[PDB]
């Protein structure tokens, strides 16, 4: 089956007092690992069910997850909602046990078997990796005068349009181009909100070797992490039962780990 | 003799006035969080207007040495006047002129005769300069408030004495304060080059209620007399405070907001209705927050009106409203004596009360 | 002459004004959410507006550097540049916002070349050009603060006043409503919602006309390019045409953001704009029967007029005759005033 | 006001801070405490003569 859930972040009041759920959605690896523990070991459950000791990637299970991050809710308040999709089922009540400050509502979850036909008018929302891998030449120093070395680099960069063609149009066309693999059909798509996401994350480091020996001293040293963002809302038409069913729950683009492809169906 | 004045007032959203944080004022009213503007802002926005304009004649200066420069023409007389206030004892102490004087002394001439009259010794010009500064009194923004002058005893010579330096000013000035609670909100902000190769803002929003009061025999009595420059001067604070706003980031908050309902009372005494916004306002959907709040000020005034009745001291009051958009007795109470729908007619049926006088004769009163 | 310009317009989801983790303008009117427009986002929009390209010299930057190898063909340097930028006191390092104008940066491409120079003396002479450079609707409108780190001058250094500031003033569009919660995809099994925003900023005079040190037909230009790019450019977006125009001759600047206290409210929200008119009418009226007009409507679709009452001097239905009214503002046609670089 | 042969202080009434609600303000809760504590000393500190005529 399918497990969904939902997070409920203020990310408002007085600005003057300290806002740690606030303070935790500005870095998407610090997200995308807090929604990572949700998930202990048979054996660390069983060790500290308090969740009061050191926190190691190795004695948690593992699954691919997707995520969404959505805002703008009125109704005099404002609200951050998390969607989580996973195949095993979260335990929200150990992840964030020492920390309900961050939410203004406790955790919800339910189940999910999404039963379709083919030729069936769906409404989808999907925020899209618009990234394509290119040949560039190696640019270095820009002291006043640009330095040329014959290197070729192997990117990752963005999708680009030219000065002539909307941005809607082009990302239409790039959903186009990969629509019949999924196995469905665009008659309409149109661009809410384009941007990035910027990320940072630890990465151990050698230093110095132990007087006494048995490994090093280590210092944490950290790496950007940047991303391009498009999220894209529309109505869809299926084209194949096990095929849709193929597109769920794997994801549509890359950067899938850091919450990249995750898509909502409602049945228009 | 004490006439109050009650501005009813709702402003857009914008920071018209801030401490150091950029955060706007605020404070704690009936135990919960209000905003806040200070008086001394207001009554500087109120003199630097164009109403408030003919009698703008008074002078709050750090810098006493440029003006007499200016004054004396194209001699040469920072030096000798800098060591005359210097020794004069305006605080030469910690390198700074950091006390502040609030003369009016428009004719500076005077001071540049003492200053250039090369017949007298050092410590002679100082007490003259000492004599002619304390006598003003005039300039009526010098009528509202004024306390110009505290020498310093330690960097002054030991051959001046000083004068009365008091004017017993008559204005009250309550800090304005909202109907309800504030809320603040953080703007971001970025300067994003041109060239190709985030911040935090603050504001909020509020409905204000203002008092004013002024006590016309100590308004009369500190200009010494001339009932027309009191009247001239009751006409022009009257206008300047109904219209007049901050300068606080108007260029990118402008909030050129009227006030919503105007209100005059004649009475003896001073009072206050603060206490009709003890509670504060809760929004209904079939209703706004200014008529809730003329509502609370409608029955706060029917209340005190009822509460401390005295048959010896009549209550005379106007209710104006633009086009007589928000009544104040709504349900059943005449509480007003007269309602007006203008505010020209309003400040001269002011007039006319006080002592009768016309607006067209008391504005050739400039001084 | 205070004119004052409304500019109540239809907007977006796909264009509005967004910001940090996601989130749309959200400003607190009222005492309810509504959601406001930035008086900086407008900022670094009306430079770049569809209409803006004939009267624009702003170049704004964070660096003078390699923007000085540029004018020039000295083909063999750039250890100058941590000399000159260092010694006037523009120092993070060399980070210093300088706004200035598009046609005089030819000499500040200049003097570079000029080998022997005291370069501990006429350091100031790139620092002497910055003095003035209020020609073009940009300074006139905008402004700078050139603030040069204190702790690093040279021996003298003049620093004449490097402060300007602005004369129009730009106001948050005012919602008139509680924005619209979304479209939650978590009760699962043309297309989105859209904000109101009574736009509006104001003119003055002597600072808004005078600041041109010469011209004047540039000041009839700029007020008609200026009304002509907000009409027609996309504040993060891309007929939209403005529902209804008000323009004043009075003499002062009205925030009139007050008039709309009560959050506009919709059980079928297909008349969010609708409440705008009629109510305007209302306060206009109340207005100008408390404390004392040409309109604009697509095919004169929306008058406002109260049906007997001369509230407006005239009603026009298209765009390029009520800029030519308001120029005909000292008389300038709009050929002359277009007329302006 | 009131008229009374011995003197009594009625502050022990405010030993508990006024904390506000959403539904009263400062004055009403202040008043309704004074208004308990005047009614638990009159009720509780005599039985005969003197009915206070405050």
Redesign the interface.
Same mark, same amino acid.
């Given at each position: 089956m399918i497990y969904l859930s939902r997070l409920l972040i203020d990310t408002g009041g007085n600005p003057d007092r300290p806002r740690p759920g606030r303070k935790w959605l500005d870095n998407i690896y610090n997200v995308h690992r807090r929604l990572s523990m949700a998930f202990p070991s048979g054996l660390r459950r069983e060790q500290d069910p308090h969740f009061l000791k050191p926190f190691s990637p190795n004695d948690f299970q593992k699954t691919p997850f997707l995520f969404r991050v959505d805002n703008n809710i009125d109704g005099n308040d404002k609200r951050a909602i998390i969607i989580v999709q996973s195949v095993l089922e979260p335990d929200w009540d150990y992840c964030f046990q020492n920390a309900l400050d961050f939410l203004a509502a406790p955790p919800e979850t339910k189940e999910y078997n999404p039963e379709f036909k083919a030729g069936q008018l769906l409404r989808f929302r999907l925020r899209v990796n618009a990234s394509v891998r290119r040949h560039i030449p190696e640019m270095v120093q820009q002291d006043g005068q640009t330095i040329e070395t014959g290197k070729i680099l192997h990117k990752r960069v963005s999708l680009t349009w030219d000065a002539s063609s909307t941005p809607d149009q082009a990302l239409a066309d790039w959903l186009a181009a990969k629509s019949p693999k999924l196995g469905f059909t665009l008659q309409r798509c149109e661009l809410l909100q384009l941007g990035w996401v910027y990320g940072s994350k630890p990465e151990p480091k050698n230093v110095k070797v132990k007087e006494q020996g048995q490994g090093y001293w280590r210092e944490h040293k950290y790496n950007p992490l940047r991303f391009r963002a498009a999220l894209l809302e529309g109505v869809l038409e299926v084209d194949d039962p096990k095929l849709f069913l193929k597109t769920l729950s794997s994801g549509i683009g890359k950067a899938k780990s850091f919450g990249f492809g995750l898509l909502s169906v409602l049945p228009i | 003799m004490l006439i109050e004045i009650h501005m009813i007032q %709702?402003? #857009?959203?914008?920071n018209l006035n801030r401490d150091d944080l950029g $955060?706007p004022k605020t404070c704690y009213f !009936? !135990?919960?969080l209000r905003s806040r503007i200070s008086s001394q802002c207001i009554k500087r926005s109120i003199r630097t207007s164009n109403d408030f304009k003919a009698l703008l004649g008074g002078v709050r200066t750090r810098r006493l040495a440029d003006l007499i420069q200016q004054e004396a023409g194209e001699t040469e007389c920072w030096k000798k006047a800098q060591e005359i206030l210097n020794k004069c004892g305006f605080k030469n102490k910690d390198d700074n002129t950091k006390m502040l004087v609030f003369m009016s002394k428009d004719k500076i001439k005077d001071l540049a005769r003492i200053v250039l009259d090369n017949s007298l010794g050092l410590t002679e010009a100082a007490q003259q300069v000492a004599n002619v500064i304390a006598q003003a009194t005039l300039a009526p923004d010098i009528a509202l408030c004024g306390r110009m002058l505290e020498p310093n005893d330690k960097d002054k010579d030991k051959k001046v004495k000083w004068s009365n330096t008091t004017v017993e000013a008559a204005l009250q000035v309550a800090h304005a304060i909202s109907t309800? =609670?504030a809320?603040?909100? =953080?703007?971001?902000?970025? $300067?994003? /080059? /041109?060239?190709p190769? =985030?911040g935090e803002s603050?504001?909020? #929003?509020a409905?204000f209620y203002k008092y004013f009061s002024i006590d016309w025999e100590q308004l009369v009595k500190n200009l010494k007399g001339d009932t027309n420059l009191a009247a001239h001067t009751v006409g022009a604070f009257l206008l300047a405070a109904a219209?007049t706003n901050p300068s606080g980031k108007?260029? #990118?908050?402008?909030?050129? @907001?009227?006030p919503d309902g105007i209100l005059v009372e004649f009475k003896n005494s001073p009072i206050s209705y603060a @206490?009709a916004f003890?509670?504060p306002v809760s929004?209904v959907?079939e209703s706004? &927050?200014?008529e809730q709040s003329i509502g609370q000020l409608s029955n706060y005034v029917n209340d005190i009106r009822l509460g401390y009745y005295d048959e010896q001291s009549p209550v005379i009051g106007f209710w104006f409203?633009? %086009?007589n958009?928000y009544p104040l007795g709504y349900k059943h109470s005449k509480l007003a004596s007269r309602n007006i !729908? @203008? &505010?020209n007619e309003l400040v001269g049926a002011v007039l006319d009360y006080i002592g009768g006088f016309k607006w067209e004769e008391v504005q050739k009163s400039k001084a």
């Open positions: - | %709702n402003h #857009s959203p914008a $955060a !009936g !135990g919960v309800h =609670i809320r603040p909100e =953080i703007d971001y902000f970025v $300067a994003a /080059d /041109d060239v190769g =985030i603050m504001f909020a #929003s409905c219209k108007q260029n #990118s908050f402008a909030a050129h @907001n009227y @206490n003890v509670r929004v959907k706004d &927050l200014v409203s633009p %086009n958009r !729908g @203008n &505010l």
